[PDB]
Amino acid sequence: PPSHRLTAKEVFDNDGKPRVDILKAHLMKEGRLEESVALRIITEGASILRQEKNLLDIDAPVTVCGDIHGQFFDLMKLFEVGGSPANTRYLFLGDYVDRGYFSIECVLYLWALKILYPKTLFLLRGNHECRHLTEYFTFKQECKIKYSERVYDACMDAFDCLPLAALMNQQFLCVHGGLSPEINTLDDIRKLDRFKEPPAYGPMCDILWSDPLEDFGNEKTQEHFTHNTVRGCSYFYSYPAVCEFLQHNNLLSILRAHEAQDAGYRMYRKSQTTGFPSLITIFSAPNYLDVYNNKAAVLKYENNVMNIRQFNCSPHP
Ligand SMILES: [Zn+2]
């Protein structure tokens, strides 16, 4: 891992676009950047993000991706499986940081790609993109060691600029956690003020934190939303709540991440009327936590086909 800290001119061409190949290689050696350079990437990236909508509007094809949790080296593998971002359209559903030892690298790298491919590649906000979880888990400490608090802070402000939702090919709602009792139409997502720390309660907290019932699709009652005793906040939503939201908004499915799958992913119960899974969980961090031993996966919607690409862990020396 080289004591050299990349300079701005090494990392950005004179036109101000980043040389990601050089960036990726240096970071994969556990390189660091000049703090100067890191801040520029974050703030320039955030300026782009802040001008995006609460709810992004993406056309297919796209490869949609789940949780990373600072597994930088599995992210490099993910791009190999998913296709280069130069010719591939990407949507990430949050949780870029914490748990993994390379959270700052994931952010610097992804934000560099956003600056470079502002209209190909997209980022959603995950529940870890806040002060409260990053203060509790690794990420704030990591920034303090490898760079500074200032970088950490720049990241927090940049994370507040992250859109919450994405409407994909006018068929899918893509969100990190899921639904809210307080979000009934797509317009409701439009009207949220996203530029802030996620509140403890609310429609914004819900999108980021909600989970499907543990027995989703086979529930006892018609029970719709019930406090999420697993997260200790927000809600568990049921198959009938989802089916209702889908029909009312003329949508096909909700794609989300957050709950971590062995498979890499998880179809849920087919919407009664469409014949299509009502909900799909995508988790993109292989051998999560060095103990789950799970596959990761990304979703490739393209040309009206829907592939899923699973992948394993990638190593280091
Ligand atoms: Zn999450």
Author numbering: 24 to 340
Please share excerpts from the published article on this structure.
The structure of the catalytic domain of human CNAα (residues 2–347) has been determined from hexagonal crystals. The two subunits of the catalytic domain contained in the asymmetric unit presenting important structural differences. The first subunit in the crystal shows the essentially invariant conformation (herein referred to as trans-CNA) found in all available structures of CN and other PPP phosphatases. The second subunit in the crystal shows an alternative new conformation (herein referred to as cis-CNA). Residue Pro309 within the SAPNY sequence is a peptidyl trans isomer in trans-CNA, while it is a cis isomer in cis-CNA. The thirteen residues long connection (Phe306-Lys318) joining strands β12 and β13 in trans-CNA is reduced to a standard VIa-1 β-turn with only four residues SAP309N in cis-CNA. Strand β13 presents a ten residue shift between the two conformations with Asn310 in cis-CNA being structurally equivalent to Ala320 in trans-CNA. The decrease in the number of residues for the β12-β13 connection together with the amino acid sequence changes in strand β13, can explain the destabilization of loop 6 and of strand β11 that in cis-CNA are disordered from Ala283 until Arg289. Instead, in cis-CNA the acidic and C-terminal binding grooves merge into a continuous surface, due to the reduction of loop 7 and the flexibility of loop 6, rendering the catalytic metal ions accessible to substrates with wider binding surfaces than for trans-CNA. The standard PxIxIT binding site in the trans-CNA subunit (sequence VMNIRQF starting with Val328), is occupied by the shifted sequence AAVLKYE (starting with Ala319) from the β14 strand of the neighbor cis-CNA.
